Short mmCIF file of C-alpha atoms in Angstrom, two decimals:
data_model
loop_
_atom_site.label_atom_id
_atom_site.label_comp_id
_atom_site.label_asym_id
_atom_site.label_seq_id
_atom_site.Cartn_x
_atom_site.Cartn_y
_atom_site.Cartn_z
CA UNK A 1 0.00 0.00 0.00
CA UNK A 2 0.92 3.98 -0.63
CA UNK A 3 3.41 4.65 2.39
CA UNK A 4 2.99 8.43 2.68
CA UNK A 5 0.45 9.19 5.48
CA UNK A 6 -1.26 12.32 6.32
CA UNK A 7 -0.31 15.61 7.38
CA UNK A 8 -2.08 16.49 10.97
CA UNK A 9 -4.47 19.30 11.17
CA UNK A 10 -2.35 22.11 12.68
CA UNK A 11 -3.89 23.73 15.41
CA UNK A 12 -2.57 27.46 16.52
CA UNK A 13 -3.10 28.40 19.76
CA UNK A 14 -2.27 31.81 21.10
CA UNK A 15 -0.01 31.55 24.33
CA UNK A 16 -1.66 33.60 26.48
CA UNK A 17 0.00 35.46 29.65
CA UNK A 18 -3.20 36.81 31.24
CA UNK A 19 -6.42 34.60 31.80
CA UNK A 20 -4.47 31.76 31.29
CA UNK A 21 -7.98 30.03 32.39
CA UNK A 22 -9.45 30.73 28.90
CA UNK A 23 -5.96 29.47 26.78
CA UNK A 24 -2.46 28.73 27.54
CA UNK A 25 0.69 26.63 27.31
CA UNK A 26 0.77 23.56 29.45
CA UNK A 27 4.48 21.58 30.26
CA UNK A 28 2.65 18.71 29.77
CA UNK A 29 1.17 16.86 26.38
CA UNK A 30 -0.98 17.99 24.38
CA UNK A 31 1.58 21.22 25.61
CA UNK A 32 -2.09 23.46 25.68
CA UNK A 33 -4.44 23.37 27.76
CA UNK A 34 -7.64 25.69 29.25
CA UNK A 35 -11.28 26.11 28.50
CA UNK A 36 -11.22 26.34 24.89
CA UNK A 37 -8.82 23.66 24.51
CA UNK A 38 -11.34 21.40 26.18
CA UNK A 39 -14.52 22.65 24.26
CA UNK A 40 -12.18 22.21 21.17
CA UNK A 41 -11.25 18.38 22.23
CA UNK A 42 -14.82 17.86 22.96
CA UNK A 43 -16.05 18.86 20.25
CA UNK A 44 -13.31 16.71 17.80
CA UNK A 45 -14.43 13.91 19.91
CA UNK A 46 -18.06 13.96 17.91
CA UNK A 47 -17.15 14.41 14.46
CA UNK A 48 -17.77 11.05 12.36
CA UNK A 49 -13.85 10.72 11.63
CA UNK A 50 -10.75 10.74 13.48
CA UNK A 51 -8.68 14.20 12.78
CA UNK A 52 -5.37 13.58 13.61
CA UNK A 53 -3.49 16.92 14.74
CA UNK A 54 -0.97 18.87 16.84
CA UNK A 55 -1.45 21.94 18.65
CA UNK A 56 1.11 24.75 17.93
CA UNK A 57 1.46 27.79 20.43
CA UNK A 58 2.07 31.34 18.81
CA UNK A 59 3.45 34.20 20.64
CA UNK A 60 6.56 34.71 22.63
CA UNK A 61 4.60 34.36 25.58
CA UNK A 62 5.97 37.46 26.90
CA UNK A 63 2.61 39.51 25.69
CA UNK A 64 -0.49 38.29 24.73
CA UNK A 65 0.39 37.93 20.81
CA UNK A 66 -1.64 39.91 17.85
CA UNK A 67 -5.02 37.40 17.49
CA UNK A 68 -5.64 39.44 14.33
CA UNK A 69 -1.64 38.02 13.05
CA UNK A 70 -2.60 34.02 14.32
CA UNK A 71 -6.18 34.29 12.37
CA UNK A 72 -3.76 35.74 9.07
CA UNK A 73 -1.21 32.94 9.92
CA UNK A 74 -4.64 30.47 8.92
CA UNK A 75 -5.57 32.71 5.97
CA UNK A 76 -1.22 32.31 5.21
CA UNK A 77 -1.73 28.05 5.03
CA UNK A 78 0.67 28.26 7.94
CA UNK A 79 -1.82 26.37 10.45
CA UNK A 80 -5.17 25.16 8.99
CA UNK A 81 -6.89 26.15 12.28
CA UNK A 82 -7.41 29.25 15.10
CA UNK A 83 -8.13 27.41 18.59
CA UNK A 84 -8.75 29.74 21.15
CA UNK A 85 -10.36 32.39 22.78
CA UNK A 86 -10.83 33.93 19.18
CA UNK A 87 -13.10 36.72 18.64
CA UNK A 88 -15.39 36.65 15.49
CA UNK A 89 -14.35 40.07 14.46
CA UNK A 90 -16.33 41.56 11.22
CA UNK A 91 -12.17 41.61 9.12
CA UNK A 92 -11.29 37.97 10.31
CA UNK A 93 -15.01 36.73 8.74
CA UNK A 94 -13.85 37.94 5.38
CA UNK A 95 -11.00 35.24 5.53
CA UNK A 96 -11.87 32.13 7.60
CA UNK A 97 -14.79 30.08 8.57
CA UNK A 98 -15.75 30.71 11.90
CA UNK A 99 -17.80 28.20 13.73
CA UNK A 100 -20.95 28.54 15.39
CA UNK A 101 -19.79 30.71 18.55
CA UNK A 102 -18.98 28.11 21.35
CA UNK A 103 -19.32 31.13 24.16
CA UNK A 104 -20.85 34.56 23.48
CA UNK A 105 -18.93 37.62 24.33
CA UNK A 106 -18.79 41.71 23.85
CA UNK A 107 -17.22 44.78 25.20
CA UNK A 108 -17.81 46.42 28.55
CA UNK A 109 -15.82 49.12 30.32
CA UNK A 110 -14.48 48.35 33.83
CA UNK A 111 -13.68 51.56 36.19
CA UNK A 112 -13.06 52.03 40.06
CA UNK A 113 -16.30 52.89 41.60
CA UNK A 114 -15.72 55.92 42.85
CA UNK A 115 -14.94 57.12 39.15
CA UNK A 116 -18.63 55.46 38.22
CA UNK A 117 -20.16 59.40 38.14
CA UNK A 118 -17.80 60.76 35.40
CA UNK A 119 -17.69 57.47 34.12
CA UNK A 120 -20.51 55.31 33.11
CA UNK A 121 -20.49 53.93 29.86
CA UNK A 122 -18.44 54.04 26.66
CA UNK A 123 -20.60 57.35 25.43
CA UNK A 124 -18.91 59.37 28.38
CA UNK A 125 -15.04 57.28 28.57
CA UNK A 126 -15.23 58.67 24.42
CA UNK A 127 -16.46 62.15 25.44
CA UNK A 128 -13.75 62.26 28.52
CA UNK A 129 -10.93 62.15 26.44
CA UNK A 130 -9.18 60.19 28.86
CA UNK A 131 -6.69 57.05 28.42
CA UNK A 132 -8.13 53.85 27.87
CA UNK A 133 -6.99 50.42 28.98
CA UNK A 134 -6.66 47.43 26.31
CA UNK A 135 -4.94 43.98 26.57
CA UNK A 136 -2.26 43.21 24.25
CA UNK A 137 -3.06 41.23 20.99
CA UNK A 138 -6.93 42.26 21.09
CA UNK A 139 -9.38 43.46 18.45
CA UNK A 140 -10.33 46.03 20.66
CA UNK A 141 -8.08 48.89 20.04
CA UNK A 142 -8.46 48.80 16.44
CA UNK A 143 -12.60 48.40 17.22
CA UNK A 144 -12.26 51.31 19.52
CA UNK A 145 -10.27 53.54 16.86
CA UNK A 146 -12.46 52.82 14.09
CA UNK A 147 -15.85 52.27 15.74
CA UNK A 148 -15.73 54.50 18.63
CA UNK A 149 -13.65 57.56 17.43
CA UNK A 150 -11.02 56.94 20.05
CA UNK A 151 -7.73 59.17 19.28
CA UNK A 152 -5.14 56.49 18.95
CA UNK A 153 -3.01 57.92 21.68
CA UNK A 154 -5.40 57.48 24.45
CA UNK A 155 -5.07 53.62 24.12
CA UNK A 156 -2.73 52.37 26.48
CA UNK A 157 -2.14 48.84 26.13
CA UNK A 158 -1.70 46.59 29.70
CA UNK A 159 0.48 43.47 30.01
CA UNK A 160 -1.59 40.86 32.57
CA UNK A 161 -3.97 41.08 35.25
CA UNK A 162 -1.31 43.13 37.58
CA UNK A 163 -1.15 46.22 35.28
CA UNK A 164 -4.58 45.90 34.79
CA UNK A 165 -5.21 46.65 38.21
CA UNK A 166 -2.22 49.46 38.51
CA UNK A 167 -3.75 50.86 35.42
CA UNK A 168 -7.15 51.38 37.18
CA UNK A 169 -5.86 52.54 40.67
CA UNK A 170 -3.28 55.10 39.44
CA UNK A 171 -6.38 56.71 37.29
CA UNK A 172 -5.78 59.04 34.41
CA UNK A 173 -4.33 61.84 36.13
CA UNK A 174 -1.32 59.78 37.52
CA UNK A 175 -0.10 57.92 35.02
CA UNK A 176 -3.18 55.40 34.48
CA UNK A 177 -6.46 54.68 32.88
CA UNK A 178 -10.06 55.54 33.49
CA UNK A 179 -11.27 52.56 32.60
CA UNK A 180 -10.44 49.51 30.82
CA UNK A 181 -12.04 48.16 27.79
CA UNK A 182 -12.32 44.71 27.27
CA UNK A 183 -14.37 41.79 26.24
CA UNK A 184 -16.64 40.44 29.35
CA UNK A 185 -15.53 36.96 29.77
CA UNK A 186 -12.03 38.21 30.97
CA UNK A 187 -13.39 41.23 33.28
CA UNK A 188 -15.41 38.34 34.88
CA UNK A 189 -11.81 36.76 35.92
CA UNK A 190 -10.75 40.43 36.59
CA UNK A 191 -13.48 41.29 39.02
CA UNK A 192 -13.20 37.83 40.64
CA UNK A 193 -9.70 39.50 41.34
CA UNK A 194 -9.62 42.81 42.55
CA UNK A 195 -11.92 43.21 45.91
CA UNK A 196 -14.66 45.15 44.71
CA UNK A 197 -13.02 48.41 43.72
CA UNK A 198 -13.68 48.41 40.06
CA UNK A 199 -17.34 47.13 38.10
CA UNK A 200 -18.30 47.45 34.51
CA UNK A 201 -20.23 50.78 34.13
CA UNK A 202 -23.49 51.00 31.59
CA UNK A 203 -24.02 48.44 28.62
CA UNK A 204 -22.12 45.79 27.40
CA UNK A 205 -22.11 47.87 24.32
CA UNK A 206 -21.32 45.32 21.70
CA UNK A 207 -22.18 41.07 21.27
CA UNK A 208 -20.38 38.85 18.99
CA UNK A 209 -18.54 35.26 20.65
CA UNK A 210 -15.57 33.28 20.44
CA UNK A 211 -15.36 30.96 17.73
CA UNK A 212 -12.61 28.04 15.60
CA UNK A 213 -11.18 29.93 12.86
CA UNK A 214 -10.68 27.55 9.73
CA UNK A 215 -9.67 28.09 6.46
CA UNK A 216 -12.52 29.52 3.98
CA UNK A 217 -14.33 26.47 2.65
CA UNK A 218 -13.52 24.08 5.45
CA UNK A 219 -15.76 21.19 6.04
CA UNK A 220 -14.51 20.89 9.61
CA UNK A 221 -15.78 24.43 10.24
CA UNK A 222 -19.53 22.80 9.52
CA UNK A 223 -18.93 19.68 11.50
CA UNK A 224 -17.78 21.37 14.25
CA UNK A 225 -20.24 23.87 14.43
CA UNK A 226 -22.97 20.77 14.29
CA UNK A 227 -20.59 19.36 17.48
CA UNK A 228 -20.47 22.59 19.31
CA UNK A 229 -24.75 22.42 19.33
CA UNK A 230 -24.64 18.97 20.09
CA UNK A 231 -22.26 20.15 23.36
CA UNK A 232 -24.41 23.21 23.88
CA UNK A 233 -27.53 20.73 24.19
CA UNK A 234 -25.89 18.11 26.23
CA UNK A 235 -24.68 20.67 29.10
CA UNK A 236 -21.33 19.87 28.23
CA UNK A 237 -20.30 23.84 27.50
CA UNK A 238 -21.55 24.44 30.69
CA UNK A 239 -19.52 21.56 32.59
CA UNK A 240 -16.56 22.54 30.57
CA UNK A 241 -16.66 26.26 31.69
CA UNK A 242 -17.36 25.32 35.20
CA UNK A 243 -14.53 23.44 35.43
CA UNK A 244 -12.06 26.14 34.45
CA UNK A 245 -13.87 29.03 35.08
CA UNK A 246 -15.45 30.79 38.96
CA UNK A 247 -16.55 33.88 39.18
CA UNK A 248 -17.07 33.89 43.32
CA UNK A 249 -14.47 36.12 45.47
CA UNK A 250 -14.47 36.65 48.89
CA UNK A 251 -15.95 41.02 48.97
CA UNK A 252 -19.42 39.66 47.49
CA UNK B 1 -26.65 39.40 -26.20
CA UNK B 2 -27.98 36.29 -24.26
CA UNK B 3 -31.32 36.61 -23.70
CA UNK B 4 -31.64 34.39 -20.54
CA UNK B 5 -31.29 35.97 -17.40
CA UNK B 6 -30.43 34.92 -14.05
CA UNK B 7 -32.76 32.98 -11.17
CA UNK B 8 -33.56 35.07 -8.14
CA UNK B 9 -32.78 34.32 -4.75
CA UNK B 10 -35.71 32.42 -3.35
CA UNK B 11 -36.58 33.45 0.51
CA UNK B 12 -38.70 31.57 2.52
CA UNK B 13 -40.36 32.84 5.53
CA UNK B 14 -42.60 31.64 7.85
CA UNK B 15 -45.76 33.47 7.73
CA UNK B 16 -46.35 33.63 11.45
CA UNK B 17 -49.82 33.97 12.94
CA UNK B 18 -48.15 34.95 16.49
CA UNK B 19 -45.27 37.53 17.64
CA UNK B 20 -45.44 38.67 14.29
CA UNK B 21 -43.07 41.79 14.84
CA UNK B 22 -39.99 39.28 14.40
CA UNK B 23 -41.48 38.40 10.93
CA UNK B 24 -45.04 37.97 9.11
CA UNK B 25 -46.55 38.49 5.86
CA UNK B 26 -47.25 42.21 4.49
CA UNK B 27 -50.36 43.56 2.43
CA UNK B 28 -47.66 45.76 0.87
CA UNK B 29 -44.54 44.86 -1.30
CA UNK B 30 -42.10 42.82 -0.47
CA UNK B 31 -45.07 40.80 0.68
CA UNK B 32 -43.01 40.09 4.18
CA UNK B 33 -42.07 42.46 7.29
CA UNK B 34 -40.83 42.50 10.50
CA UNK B 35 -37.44 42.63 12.29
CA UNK B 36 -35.91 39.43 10.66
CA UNK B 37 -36.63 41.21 7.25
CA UNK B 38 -35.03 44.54 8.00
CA UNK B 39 -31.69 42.75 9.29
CA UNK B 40 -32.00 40.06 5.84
CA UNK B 41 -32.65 43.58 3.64
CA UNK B 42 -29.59 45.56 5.62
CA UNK B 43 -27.11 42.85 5.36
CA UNK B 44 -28.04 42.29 1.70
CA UNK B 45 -27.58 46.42 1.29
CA UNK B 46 -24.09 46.03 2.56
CA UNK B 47 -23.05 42.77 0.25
CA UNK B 48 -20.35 43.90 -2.50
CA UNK B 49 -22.83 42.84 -5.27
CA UNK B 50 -26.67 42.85 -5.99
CA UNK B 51 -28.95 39.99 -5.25
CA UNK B 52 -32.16 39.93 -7.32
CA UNK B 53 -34.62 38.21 -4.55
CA UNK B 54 -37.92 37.69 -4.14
CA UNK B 55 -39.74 36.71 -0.83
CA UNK B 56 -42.06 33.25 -0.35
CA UNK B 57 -44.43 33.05 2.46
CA UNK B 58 -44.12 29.46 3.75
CA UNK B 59 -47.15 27.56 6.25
CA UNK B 60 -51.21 28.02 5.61
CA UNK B 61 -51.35 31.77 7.87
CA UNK B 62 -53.77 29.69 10.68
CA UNK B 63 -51.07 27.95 12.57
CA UNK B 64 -46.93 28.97 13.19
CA UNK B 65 -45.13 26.35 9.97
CA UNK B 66 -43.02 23.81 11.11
CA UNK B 67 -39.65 25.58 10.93
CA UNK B 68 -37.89 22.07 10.46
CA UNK B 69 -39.87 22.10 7.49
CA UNK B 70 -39.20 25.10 6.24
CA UNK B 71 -35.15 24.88 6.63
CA UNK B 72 -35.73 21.44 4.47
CA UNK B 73 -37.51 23.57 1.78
CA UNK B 74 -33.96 25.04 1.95
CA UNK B 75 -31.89 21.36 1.40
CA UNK B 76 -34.15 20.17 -1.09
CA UNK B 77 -33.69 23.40 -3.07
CA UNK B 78 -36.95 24.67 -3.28
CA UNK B 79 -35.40 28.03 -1.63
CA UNK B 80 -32.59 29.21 -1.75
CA UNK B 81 -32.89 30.33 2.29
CA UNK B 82 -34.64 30.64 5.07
CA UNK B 83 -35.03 33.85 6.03
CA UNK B 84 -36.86 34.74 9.63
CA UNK B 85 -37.02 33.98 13.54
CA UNK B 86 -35.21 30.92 12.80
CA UNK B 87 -33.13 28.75 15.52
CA UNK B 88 -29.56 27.47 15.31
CA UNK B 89 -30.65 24.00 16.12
CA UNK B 90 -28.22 20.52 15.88
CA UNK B 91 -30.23 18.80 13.09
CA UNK B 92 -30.60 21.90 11.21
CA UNK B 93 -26.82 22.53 11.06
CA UNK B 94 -25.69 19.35 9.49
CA UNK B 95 -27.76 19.96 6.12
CA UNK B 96 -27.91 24.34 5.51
CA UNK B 97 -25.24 26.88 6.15
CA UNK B 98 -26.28 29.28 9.00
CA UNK B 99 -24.78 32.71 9.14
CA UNK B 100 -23.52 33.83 12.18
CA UNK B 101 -26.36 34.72 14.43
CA UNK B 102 -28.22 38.04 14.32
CA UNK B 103 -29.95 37.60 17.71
CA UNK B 104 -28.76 35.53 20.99
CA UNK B 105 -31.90 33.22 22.07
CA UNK B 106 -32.30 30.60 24.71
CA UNK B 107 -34.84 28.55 26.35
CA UNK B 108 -36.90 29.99 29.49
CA UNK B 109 -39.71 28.34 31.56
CA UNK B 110 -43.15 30.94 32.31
CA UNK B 111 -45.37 30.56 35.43
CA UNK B 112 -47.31 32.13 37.16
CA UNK B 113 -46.02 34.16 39.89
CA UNK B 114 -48.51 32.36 41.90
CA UNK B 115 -47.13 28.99 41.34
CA UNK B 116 -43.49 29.84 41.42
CA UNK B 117 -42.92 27.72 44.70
CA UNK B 118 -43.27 24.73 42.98
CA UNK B 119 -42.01 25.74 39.42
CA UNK B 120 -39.04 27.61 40.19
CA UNK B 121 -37.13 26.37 36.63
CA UNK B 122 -37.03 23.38 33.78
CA UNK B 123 -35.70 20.54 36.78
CA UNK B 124 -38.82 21.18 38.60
CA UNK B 125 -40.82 21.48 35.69
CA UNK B 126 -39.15 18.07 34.01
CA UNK B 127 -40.15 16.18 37.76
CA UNK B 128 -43.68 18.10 38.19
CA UNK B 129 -45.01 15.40 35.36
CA UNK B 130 -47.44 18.41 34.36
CA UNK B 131 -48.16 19.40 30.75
CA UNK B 132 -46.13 21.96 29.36
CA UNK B 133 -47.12 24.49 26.50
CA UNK B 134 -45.02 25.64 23.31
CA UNK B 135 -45.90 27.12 19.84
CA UNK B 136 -46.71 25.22 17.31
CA UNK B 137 -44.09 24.58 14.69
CA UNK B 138 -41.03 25.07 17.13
CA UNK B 139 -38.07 23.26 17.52
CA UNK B 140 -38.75 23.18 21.83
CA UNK B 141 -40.99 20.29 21.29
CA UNK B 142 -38.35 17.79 19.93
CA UNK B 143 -35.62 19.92 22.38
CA UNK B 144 -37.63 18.79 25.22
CA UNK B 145 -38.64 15.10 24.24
CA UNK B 146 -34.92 13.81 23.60
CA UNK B 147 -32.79 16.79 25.73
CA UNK B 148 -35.00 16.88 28.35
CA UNK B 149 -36.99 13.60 28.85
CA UNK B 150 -40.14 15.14 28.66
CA UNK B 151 -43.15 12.40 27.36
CA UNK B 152 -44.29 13.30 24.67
CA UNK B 153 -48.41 13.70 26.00
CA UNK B 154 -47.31 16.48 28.07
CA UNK B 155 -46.56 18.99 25.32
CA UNK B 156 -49.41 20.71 24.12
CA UNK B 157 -48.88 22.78 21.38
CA UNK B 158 -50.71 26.22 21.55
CA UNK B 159 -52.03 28.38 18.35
CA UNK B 160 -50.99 32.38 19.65
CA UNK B 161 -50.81 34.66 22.64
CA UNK B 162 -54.63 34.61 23.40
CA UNK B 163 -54.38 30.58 23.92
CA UNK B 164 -50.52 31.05 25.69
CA UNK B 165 -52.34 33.45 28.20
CA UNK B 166 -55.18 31.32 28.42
CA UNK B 167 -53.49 27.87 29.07
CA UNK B 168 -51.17 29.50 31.83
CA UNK B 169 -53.91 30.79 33.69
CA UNK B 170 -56.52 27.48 33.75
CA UNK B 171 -52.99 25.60 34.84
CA UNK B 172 -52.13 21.87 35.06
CA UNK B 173 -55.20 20.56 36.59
CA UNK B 174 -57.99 22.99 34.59
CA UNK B 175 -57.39 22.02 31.29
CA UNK B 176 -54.41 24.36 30.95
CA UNK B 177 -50.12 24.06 32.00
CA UNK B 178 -48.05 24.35 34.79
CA UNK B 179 -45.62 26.42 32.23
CA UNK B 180 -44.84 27.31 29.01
CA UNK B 181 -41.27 26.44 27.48
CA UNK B 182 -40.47 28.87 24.71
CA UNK B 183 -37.48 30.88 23.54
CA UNK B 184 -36.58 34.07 25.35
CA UNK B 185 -37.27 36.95 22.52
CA UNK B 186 -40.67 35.58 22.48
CA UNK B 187 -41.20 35.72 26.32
CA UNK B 188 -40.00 39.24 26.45
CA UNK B 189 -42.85 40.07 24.43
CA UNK B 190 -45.62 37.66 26.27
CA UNK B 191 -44.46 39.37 29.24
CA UNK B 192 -45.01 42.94 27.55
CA UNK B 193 -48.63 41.96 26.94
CA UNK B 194 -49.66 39.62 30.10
CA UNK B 195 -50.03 42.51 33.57
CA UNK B 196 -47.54 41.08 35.53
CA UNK B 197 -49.33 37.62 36.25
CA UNK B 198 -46.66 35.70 34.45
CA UNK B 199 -42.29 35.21 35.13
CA UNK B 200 -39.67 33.33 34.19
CA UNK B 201 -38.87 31.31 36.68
CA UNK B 202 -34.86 29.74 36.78
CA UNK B 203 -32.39 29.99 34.61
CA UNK B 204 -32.08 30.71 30.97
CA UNK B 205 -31.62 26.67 30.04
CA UNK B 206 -30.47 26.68 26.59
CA UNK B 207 -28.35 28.94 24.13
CA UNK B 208 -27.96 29.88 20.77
CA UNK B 209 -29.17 32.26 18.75
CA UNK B 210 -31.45 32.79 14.91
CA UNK B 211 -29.52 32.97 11.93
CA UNK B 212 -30.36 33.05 7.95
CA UNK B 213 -30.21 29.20 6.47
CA UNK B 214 -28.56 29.34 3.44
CA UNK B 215 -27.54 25.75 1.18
CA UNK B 216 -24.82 24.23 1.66
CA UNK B 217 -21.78 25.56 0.29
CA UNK B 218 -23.13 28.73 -0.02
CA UNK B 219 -20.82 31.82 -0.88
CA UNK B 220 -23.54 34.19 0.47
CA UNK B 221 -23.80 32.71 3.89
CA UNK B 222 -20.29 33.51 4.20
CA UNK B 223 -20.92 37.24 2.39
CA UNK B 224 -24.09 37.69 4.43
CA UNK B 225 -22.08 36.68 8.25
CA UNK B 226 -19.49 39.30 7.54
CA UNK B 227 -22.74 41.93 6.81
CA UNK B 228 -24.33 40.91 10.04
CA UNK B 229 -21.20 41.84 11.71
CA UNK B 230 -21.20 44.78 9.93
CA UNK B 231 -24.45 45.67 11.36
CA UNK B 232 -23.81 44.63 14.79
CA UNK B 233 -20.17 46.73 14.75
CA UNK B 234 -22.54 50.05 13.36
CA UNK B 235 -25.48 49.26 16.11
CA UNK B 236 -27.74 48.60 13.58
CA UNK B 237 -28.84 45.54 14.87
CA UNK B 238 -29.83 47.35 18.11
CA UNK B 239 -31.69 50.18 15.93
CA UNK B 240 -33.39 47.84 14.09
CA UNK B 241 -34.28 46.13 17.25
CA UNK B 242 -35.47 49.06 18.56
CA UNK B 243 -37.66 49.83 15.57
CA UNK B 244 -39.70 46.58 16.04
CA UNK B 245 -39.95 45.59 19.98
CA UNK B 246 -40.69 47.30 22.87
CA UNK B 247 -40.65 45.36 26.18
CA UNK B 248 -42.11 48.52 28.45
CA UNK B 249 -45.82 48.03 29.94
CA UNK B 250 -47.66 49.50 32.31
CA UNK B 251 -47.85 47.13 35.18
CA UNK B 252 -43.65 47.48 35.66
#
């Protein structure tokens, strides 16, 4: 018989450095790990064919890397798939197949309390003209340029949970933010953190999800969209997020 | 020149009899309104070519259509798409292309506020061995059968608001049900029209979300997901929303 086998689907992760809950690098086999990982696995596990594959981190894991660069290094053939906490961004549809959203998320602006009467909503963090708080690697500052009318300047990108935090106690008038904006599954983990002295202010003022990224014209990306319903049914999403995932602290 | 010109995109839609503000049939051209329509007719504005489309009213206009049904007008090719209030369901995934969803949705259970102490949510309401409403033509009754072990006699189908009202209040042992099972967007506006007699009781117990059912394969699901995006980046989606439902009543 024909000896050449195969080539594994290649999987890129992004190696996180904050909410390493969602996505990150584990020392041991499959060398990932996290909430999406296991929604991913679960989800491979109910397709009507094996898929052999290997999961490749990308990033230096130093920052969070660019998610817009590891959806392009799908579009670029150099991994066939996105596995992650990947937001289905309106620029990344025009190039892969997203699945089905396997969690839904949107924006929401985080600020200490006692700033929540100069600050309470994205209509008056625009109209304050103060600096804004970002993660590395997100959508969001390009979403908040173009969609918002946020001078470029005011972003301030944030390294991990710690500058977060620094970011939102120094304030904008020493050295800080006024707020942070950021999708709402990872200022869940950040409130779970931080003793009650910073909420999300007014609407979460936009709604999209996480989704698998594949290449345009995948059939995976409609079998695993068919698996990520059957999970969604089965209460499996919901098992799989409590396991990783706890919201609870200590203040409230 | 050739003289033979091109097919037009054939749109189904289900021609409602209840909560007709997501979609229903029109005295007026296009024939078909609603909030479903508007998003379908702003997405198509923002594809980067025209669509020549007509729309197709789908079910008899005295009951809700089966909406299974109606997405396997779509597979056997007698439309092109569905195009309406229609759910993200398991079975319907593995034969249409769904675009990204427009609207989240979910499961919710509705009781009475008086009988809230023994249906506080669907594990109570699964044990209670009481019949159960839902619309007619719905995807909850199947949901409920094999996801939720519910037999079969206890689901009584019910025609529109007037009879959803009606079978709520006469309850389990009058003729009527200890609770209707239906998705949320409908709810919000059952609530809107029912004086405060009626809650959800327990959590939200399923999600996904509606979406337009295009064939397999199709280029314009994949056109028509970035669009939505589009819409949902602009707020459109919201304004459109806004245009169509209004939760506020009187009671609260």
């Amino acid at each position: 018989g024909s000896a050449m086998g195969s080539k594994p689907l290649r999987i890129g992760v992004p190696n996180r450095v904050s909410y390493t809950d969602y996505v990150s690098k584990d020392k041991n086999p499959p060398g990932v790990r996290g909430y999406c990982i296991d929604v991913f696995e679960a989800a491979i596990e109910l397709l009507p064919y094996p898929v052999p594959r290997t999961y490749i981190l990308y990033g230096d894991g130093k920052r969070n890397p660019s998610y817009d660069n590891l959806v392009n290094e799908v579009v670029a053939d150099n991994f066939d798939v996105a596995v992650g906490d990947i937001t289905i961004v309106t620029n990344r549809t025009r190039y892969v197949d997203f699945t089905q959203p396997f969690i839904e998320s949107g924006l929401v602006v985080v600020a200490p309390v006692k700033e929540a009467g100069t600050i309470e909503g994205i209509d008056s963090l625009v109209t304050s003209n103060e600096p804004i708080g970002v993660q590395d690697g997100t959508f969001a500052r390009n979403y908040l340029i173009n969609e918002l009318n946020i001078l470029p300047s005011r972003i301030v990108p944030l390294k991990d949970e710690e500058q977060y935090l620094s970011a939102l106690q120094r304030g904008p008038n020493a050295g800080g933010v006024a707020a942070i904006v950021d999708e709402l599954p990872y200022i869940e983990v950040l409130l779970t953190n931080s003793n009650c002295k910073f909420r999300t202010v007014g609407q979460e003022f936009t709604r999209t999800g996480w989704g698998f990224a594949f290449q345009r014209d995948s059939p995976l990306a409609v079998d695993m969209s068919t698996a990520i319903l059957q999970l969604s049914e089965e209460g499996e999403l919901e098992k799989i997020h409590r396991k990783w995932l706890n919201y609870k602290h200590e203040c409230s």
